[PDB]
mmCIF file of all heavy atoms in Angstrom:
data_model
loop_
_atom_site.group_PDB
_atom_site.id
_atom_site.type_symbol
_atom_site.label_atom_id
_atom_site.label_comp_id
_atom_site.label_asym_id
_atom_site.label_seq_id
_atom_site.Cartn_x
_atom_site.Cartn_y
_atom_site.Cartn_z
ATOM 1 N N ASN A 31 -45.137 37.892 -13.532
ATOM 2 C CA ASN A 31 -45.530 38.270 -12.181
ATOM 3 C C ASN A 31 -47.015 38.600 -12.093
ATOM 4 O O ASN A 31 -47.599 38.595 -11.009
ATOM 5 C CB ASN A 31 -44.687 39.449 -11.689
ATOM 6 C CG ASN A 31 -44.769 39.640 -10.187
ATOM 7 O OD1 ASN A 31 -44.301 38.800 -9.414
ATOM 8 N ND2 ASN A 31 -45.358 40.754 -9.765
ATOM 9 N N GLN A 32 -47.624 38.878 -13.242
ATOM 10 C CA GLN A 32 -49.039 39.231 -13.294
ATOM 11 C C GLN A 32 -49.936 38.005 -13.428
ATOM 12 O O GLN A 32 -51.154 38.130 -13.565
ATOM 13 C CB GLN A 32 -49.311 40.214 -14.434
ATOM 14 C CG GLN A 32 -48.867 41.636 -14.138
ATOM 15 C CD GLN A 32 -48.930 42.530 -15.357
ATOM 16 O OE1 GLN A 32 -49.150 42.062 -16.476
ATOM 17 N NE2 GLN A 32 -48.740 43.828 -15.148
ATOM 18 N N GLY A 33 -49.332 36.822 -13.394
ATOM 19 C CA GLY A 33 -50.091 35.587 -13.394
ATOM 20 C C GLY A 33 -50.203 34.910 -14.746
ATOM 21 O O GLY A 33 -50.792 33.834 -14.855
ATOM 22 N N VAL A 34 -49.644 35.536 -15.779
ATOM 23 C CA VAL A 34 -49.654 34.944 -17.112
ATOM 24 C C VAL A 34 -48.828 33.663 -17.108
ATOM 25 O O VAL A 34 -47.611 33.698 -16.916
ATOM 26 C CB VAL A 34 -49.106 35.912 -18.176
ATOM 27 C CG1 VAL A 34 -49.184 35.276 -19.558
ATOM 28 C CG2 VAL A 34 -49.877 37.220 -18.148
ATOM 29 N N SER A 35 -49.502 32.536 -17.311
ATOM 30 C CA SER A 35 -48.873 31.224 -17.199
ATOM 31 C C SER A 35 -47.761 31.015 -18.223
ATOM 32 O O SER A 35 -46.671 30.565 -17.878
ATOM 33 C CB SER A 35 -49.921 30.117 -17.334
ATOM 34 O OG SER A 35 -50.550 30.161 -18.603
ATOM 35 N N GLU A 36 -48.041 31.350 -19.479
ATOM 36 C CA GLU A 36 -47.088 31.124 -20.558
ATOM 37 C C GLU A 36 -46.914 32.354 -21.443
ATOM 38 O O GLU A 36 -47.894 32.940 -21.906
ATOM 39 C CB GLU A 36 -47.535 29.934 -21.408
ATOM 40 C CG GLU A 36 -46.754 29.754 -22.694
ATOM 41 C CD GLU A 36 -47.250 28.576 -23.508
ATOM 42 O OE1 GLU A 36 -47.771 27.614 -22.904
ATOM 43 O OE2 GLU A 36 -47.119 28.614 -24.750
ATOM 44 N N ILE A 37 -45.662 32.743 -21.675
ATOM 45 C CA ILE A 37 -45.373 33.856 -22.575
ATOM 46 C C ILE A 37 -44.461 33.425 -23.722
ATOM 47 O O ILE A 37 -43.738 32.433 -23.617
ATOM 48 C CB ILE A 37 -44.740 35.056 -21.838
ATOM 49 C CG1 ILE A 37 -43.296 34.748 -21.453
ATOM 50 C CG2 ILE A 37 -45.571 35.443 -20.615
ATOM 51 C CD1 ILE A 37 -42.617 35.870 -20.715
ATOM 52 N N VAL A 38 -44.505 34.174 -24.820
ATOM 53 C CA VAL A 38 -43.730 33.838 -26.008
ATOM 54 C C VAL A 38 -42.834 34.994 -26.443
ATOM 55 O O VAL A 38 -43.315 36.078 -26.764
ATOM 56 C CB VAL A 38 -44.645 33.449 -27.186
ATOM 57 C CG1 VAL A 38 -43.812 33.039 -28.393
ATOM 58 C CG2 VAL A 38 -45.591 32.325 -26.780
ATOM 59 N N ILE A 39 -41.530 34.756 -26.446
ATOM 60 C CA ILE A 39 -40.564 35.752 -26.894
ATOM 61 C C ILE A 39 -40.300 35.547 -28.384
ATOM 62 O O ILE A 39 -39.891 34.464 -28.799
ATOM 63 C CB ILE A 39 -39.234 35.634 -26.119
ATOM 64 C CG1 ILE A 39 -39.438 35.962 -24.636
ATOM 65 C CG2 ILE A 39 -38.174 36.545 -26.716
ATOM 66 C CD1 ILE A 39 -39.724 34.754 -23.771
ATOM 67 N N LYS A 40 -40.540 36.577 -29.189
ATOM 68 C CA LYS A 40 -40.375 36.448 -30.638
ATOM 69 C C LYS A 40 -39.350 37.431 -31.196
ATOM 70 O O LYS A 40 -39.257 38.566 -30.735
ATOM 71 C CB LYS A 40 -41.718 36.632 -31.350
ATOM 72 C CG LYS A 40 -42.767 35.603 -30.961
ATOM 73 C CD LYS A 40 -44.038 35.753 -31.785
ATOM 74 C CE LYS A 40 -45.084 34.731 -31.364
ATOM 75 N NZ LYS A 40 -46.332 34.825 -32.177
ATOM 76 N N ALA A 41 -38.579 36.994 -32.189
ATOM 77 C CA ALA A 41 -37.616 37.884 -32.833
ATOM 78 C C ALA A 41 -37.291 37.429 -34.248
ATOM 79 O O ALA A 41 -37.570 36.294 -34.620
ATOM 80 C CB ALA A 41 -36.339 37.983 -32.006
ATOM 81 N N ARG A 42 -36.702 38.320 -35.038
ATOM 82 C CA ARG A 42 -36.233 37.945 -36.368
ATOM 83 C C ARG A 42 -34.898 38.606 -36.694
ATOM 84 O O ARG A 42 -34.573 39.665 -36.161
ATOM 85 C CB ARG A 42 -37.279 38.281 -37.436
ATOM 86 C CG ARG A 42 -37.448 39.765 -37.715
ATOM 87 C CD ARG A 42 -38.561 40.000 -38.732
ATOM 88 N NE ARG A 42 -38.739 41.416 -39.035
ATOM 89 C CZ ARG A 42 -39.660 41.891 -39.868
ATOM 90 N NH1 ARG A 42 -40.490 41.060 -40.484
ATOM 91 N NH2 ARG A 42 -39.751 43.197 -40.085
ATOM 92 N N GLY A 43 -34.126 37.962 -37.565
ATOM 93 C CA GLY A 43 -32.839 38.482 -37.992
ATOM 94 C C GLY A 43 -31.863 38.721 -36.856
ATOM 95 O O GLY A 43 -31.709 37.884 -35.962
ATOM 96 N N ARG A 44 -31.223 39.887 -36.889
ATOM 97 C CA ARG A 44 -30.188 40.252 -35.926
ATOM 98 C C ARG A 44 -30.662 40.219 -34.473
ATOM 99 O O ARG A 44 -29.859 40.037 -33.561
ATOM 100 C CB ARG A 44 -29.631 41.642 -36.252
ATOM 101 C CG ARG A 44 -28.754 41.697 -37.491
ATOM 102 C CD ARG A 44 -28.240 43.110 -37.722
ATOM 103 N NE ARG A 44 -27.023 43.131 -38.528
ATOM 104 C CZ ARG A 44 -25.794 43.093 -38.022
ATOM 105 N NH1 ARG A 44 -25.617 43.026 -36.710
ATOM 106 N NH2 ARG A 44 -24.742 43.118 -38.829
ATOM 107 N N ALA A 45 -31.963 40.391 -34.262
ATOM 108 C CA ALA A 45 -32.516 40.420 -32.912
ATOM 109 C C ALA A 45 -32.637 39.027 -32.298
ATOM 110 O O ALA A 45 -32.927 38.897 -31.103
ATOM 111 C CB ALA A 45 -33.872 41.128 -32.901
ATOM 112 N N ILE A 46 -32.407 37.993 -33.104
ATOM 113 C CA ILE A 46 -32.588 36.619 -32.634
ATOM 114 C C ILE A 46 -31.789 36.314 -31.361
ATOM 115 O O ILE A 46 -32.341 35.802 -30.385
ATOM 116 C CB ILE A 46 -32.303 35.577 -33.741
ATOM 117 C CG1 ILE A 46 -33.467 35.544 -34.735
ATOM 118 C CG2 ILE A 46 -32.094 34.193 -33.144
ATOM 119 C CD1 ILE A 46 -33.321 34.508 -35.830
ATOM 120 N N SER A 47 -30.506 36.665 -31.354
ATOM 121 C CA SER A 47 -29.680 36.413 -30.176
ATOM 122 C C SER A 47 -30.231 37.166 -28.968
ATOM 123 O O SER A 47 -30.242 36.633 -27.856
ATOM 124 C CB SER A 47 -28.213 36.777 -30.423
ATOM 125 O OG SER A 47 -28.026 38.178 -30.518
ATOM 126 N N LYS A 48 -30.729 38.381 -29.191
ATOM 127 C CA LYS A 48 -31.285 39.160 -28.089
ATOM 128 C C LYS A 48 -32.454 38.400 -27.474
ATOM 129 O O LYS A 48 -32.600 38.363 -26.249
ATOM 130 C CB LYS A 48 -31.702 40.568 -28.535
ATOM 131 C CG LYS A 48 -32.162 41.470 -27.389
ATOM 132 C CD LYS A 48 -32.545 42.874 -27.866
ATOM 133 C CE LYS A 48 -31.327 43.676 -28.311
ATOM 134 N NZ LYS A 48 -31.714 45.028 -28.816
ATOM 135 N N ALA A 49 -33.251 37.748 -28.320
ATOM 136 C CA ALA A 49 -34.371 36.958 -27.821
ATOM 137 C C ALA A 49 -33.842 35.918 -26.845
ATOM 138 O O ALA A 49 -34.338 35.792 -25.722
ATOM 139 C CB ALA A 49 -35.117 36.288 -28.969
ATOM 140 N N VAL A 50 -32.794 35.211 -27.260
ATOM 141 C CA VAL A 50 -32.237 34.169 -26.417
ATOM 142 C C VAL A 50 -31.743 34.806 -25.127
ATOM 143 O O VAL A 50 -32.015 34.293 -24.034
ATOM 144 C CB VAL A 50 -31.110 33.387 -27.125
ATOM 145 C CG1 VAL A 50 -30.603 32.276 -26.231
ATOM 146 C CG2 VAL A 50 -31.623 32.811 -28.441
ATOM 147 N N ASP A 51 -31.082 35.959 -25.259
ATOM 148 C CA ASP A 51 -30.578 36.673 -24.092
ATOM 149 C C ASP A 51 -31.733 36.917 -23.138
ATOM 150 O O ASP A 51 -31.634 36.640 -21.932
ATOM 151 C CB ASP A 51 -29.954 38.015 -24.486
ATOM 152 C CG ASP A 51 -28.610 37.865 -25.170
ATOM 153 O OD1 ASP A 51 -27.931 36.836 -24.959
ATOM 154 O OD2 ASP A 51 -28.224 38.794 -25.910
ATOM 155 N N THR A 52 -32.844 37.390 -23.698
ATOM 156 C CA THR A 52 -33.988 37.777 -22.887
ATOM 157 C C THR A 52 -34.443 36.588 -22.063
ATOM 158 O O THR A 52 -34.728 36.719 -20.873
ATOM 159 C CB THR A 52 -35.155 38.289 -23.748
ATOM 160 O OG1 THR A 52 -34.742 39.459 -24.461
ATOM 161 C CG2 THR A 52 -36.349 38.639 -22.871
ATOM 162 N N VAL A 53 -34.468 35.414 -22.684
ATOM 163 C CA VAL A 53 -34.918 34.238 -21.965
ATOM 164 C C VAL A 53 -33.918 33.943 -20.854
ATOM 165 O O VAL A 53 -34.288 33.825 -19.679
ATOM 166 C CB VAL A 53 -35.075 33.026 -22.898
ATOM 167 C CG1 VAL A 53 -35.373 31.778 -22.094
ATOM 168 C CG2 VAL A 53 -36.182 33.288 -23.910
ATOM 169 N N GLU A 54 -32.640 33.911 -21.223
ATOM 170 C CA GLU A 54 -31.612 33.435 -20.309
ATOM 171 C C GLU A 54 -31.507 34.317 -19.074
ATOM 172 O O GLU A 54 -31.469 33.816 -17.947
ATOM 173 C CB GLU A 54 -30.270 33.301 -21.027
ATOM 174 C CG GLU A 54 -30.174 32.032 -21.866
ATOM 175 C CD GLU A 54 -30.315 30.771 -21.027
ATOM 176 O OE1 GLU A 54 -29.348 30.416 -20.318
ATOM 177 O OE2 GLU A 54 -31.391 30.136 -21.072
ATOM 178 N N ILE A 55 -31.497 35.629 -19.291
ATOM 179 C CA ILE A 55 -31.489 36.575 -18.186
ATOM 180 C C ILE A 55 -32.683 36.299 -17.276
ATOM 181 O O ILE A 55 -32.512 36.131 -16.064
ATOM 182 C CB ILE A 55 -31.492 38.032 -18.680
ATOM 183 C CG1 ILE A 55 -30.187 38.333 -19.424
ATOM 184 C CG2 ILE A 55 -31.668 38.994 -17.508
ATOM 185 C CD1 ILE A 55 -30.163 39.677 -20.118
ATOM 186 N N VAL A 56 -33.870 36.186 -17.874
ATOM 187 C CA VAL A 56 -35.087 35.929 -17.110
ATOM 188 C C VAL A 56 -34.891 34.679 -16.266
ATOM 189 O O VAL A 56 -35.287 34.631 -15.098
ATOM 190 C CB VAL A 56 -36.325 35.765 -18.027
ATOM 191 C CG1 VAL A 56 -37.430 34.987 -17.321
ATOM 192 C CG2 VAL A 56 -36.837 37.126 -18.484
ATOM 193 N N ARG A 57 -34.224 33.690 -16.852
ATOM 194 C CA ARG A 57 -33.992 32.434 -16.164
ATOM 195 C C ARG A 57 -32.876 32.564 -15.138
ATOM 196 O O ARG A 57 -32.984 32.041 -14.031
ATOM 197 C CB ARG A 57 -33.641 31.334 -17.169
ATOM 198 C CG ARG A 57 -33.387 29.979 -16.536
ATOM 199 C CD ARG A 57 -33.181 28.908 -17.592
ATOM 200 N NE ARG A 57 -31.879 29.014 -18.246
ATOM 201 C CZ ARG A 57 -30.792 28.361 -17.849
ATOM 202 N NH1 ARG A 57 -30.850 27.557 -16.794
ATOM 203 N NH2 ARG A 57 -29.646 28.508 -18.505
ATOM 204 N N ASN A 58 -31.810 33.275 -15.492
ATOM 205 C CA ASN A 58 -30.587 33.184 -14.698
ATOM 206 C C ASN A 58 -30.425 34.281 -13.657
ATOM 207 O O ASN A 58 -29.586 34.178 -12.761
ATOM 208 C CB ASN A 58 -29.347 33.107 -15.597
ATOM 209 C CG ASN A 58 -29.209 31.759 -16.288
ATOM 210 O OD1 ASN A 58 -28.992 30.732 -15.636
ATOM 211 N ND2 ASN A 58 -29.324 31.757 -17.614
ATOM 212 N N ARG A 59 -31.235 35.325 -13.769
ATOM 213 C CA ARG A 59 -31.130 36.449 -12.853
ATOM 214 C C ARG A 59 -32.323 36.524 -11.907
ATOM 215 O O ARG A 59 -32.173 36.900 -10.745
ATOM 216 C CB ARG A 59 -30.991 37.761 -13.626
ATOM 217 C CG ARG A 59 -30.802 38.975 -12.736
ATOM 218 C CD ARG A 59 -29.402 39.544 -12.856
ATOM 219 N NE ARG A 59 -29.363 40.702 -13.742
ATOM 220 C CZ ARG A 59 -29.099 40.639 -15.041
ATOM 221 N NH1 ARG A 59 -28.850 39.469 -15.611
ATOM 222 N NH2 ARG A 59 -29.083 41.745 -15.771
#
Side-chain angles (χ1 to χ4, degrees):
Chain A
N31 196 67
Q32 284 170 351
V34 182
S35 62
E36 170 181 331
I37 73 181
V38 183
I39 295 93
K40 299 185 181 182
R42 71 183 181 181
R44 288 181 157 269
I46 285 183
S47 70
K48 186 179 290 178
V50 182
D51 287 336
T52 298
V53 173
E54 281 299 285
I55 295 172
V56 158
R57 180 174 74 93
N58 287 294
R59 183 110 100 267

